[PDB]
């Protein structure tokens, strides 16, 4: 109902993402939210700790599973309002598009 980012104070985020960068050597913190104008369901959880070696596509696979979104319906992940290549590694998108607060913000829609 409210973009995670606007939901908490910077220091609260940078603190956590930093505590995350400590407790997990090869994991990645991802905030995954629904595009405002997409019909597809709103996920229950939006903070993920994705494995270093995980690809975009695979991560998509995970989101689909989370909303129980049927193979006919299409979904799309965006980063910085861009469509990362499905073959990419999440870590790479992170190191290249993370937020100043330490998280990699990702949105999904399909419609």
């Amino acid at each position: 109902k409210s973009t995670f980012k606007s939901e908490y104070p910077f220091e609260k985020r940078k603190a956590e993402s930093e505590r995350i960068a400590d407790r997990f050597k090869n994991r990645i913190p991802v905030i995954c939210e629904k595009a405002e104008k997409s019909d597809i369901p709103e996920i229950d959880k939006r903070k993920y700790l994705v494995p270093a070696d995980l690809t975009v596509g695979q991560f998509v696979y995970v989101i689909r599973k989370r909303i129980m979104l049927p193979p006919e319906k299409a979904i799309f992940i965006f980063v910085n309002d861009t469509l990362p290549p499905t073959a990419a590694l999440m870590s790479a998108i992170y190191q290249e598009h993370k937020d100043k607060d330490g998280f990699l913000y990702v949105t999904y829609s399909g419609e």
Binding site: R27, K45, K47, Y48, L49, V50, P51, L54, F59
Partner: peptide, 6 residues
């Protein structure tokens, strides 16, 4: 809070 992927 956080959901870890395997």
């Amino acid at each position: 809070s956080w959901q870890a992927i395997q």
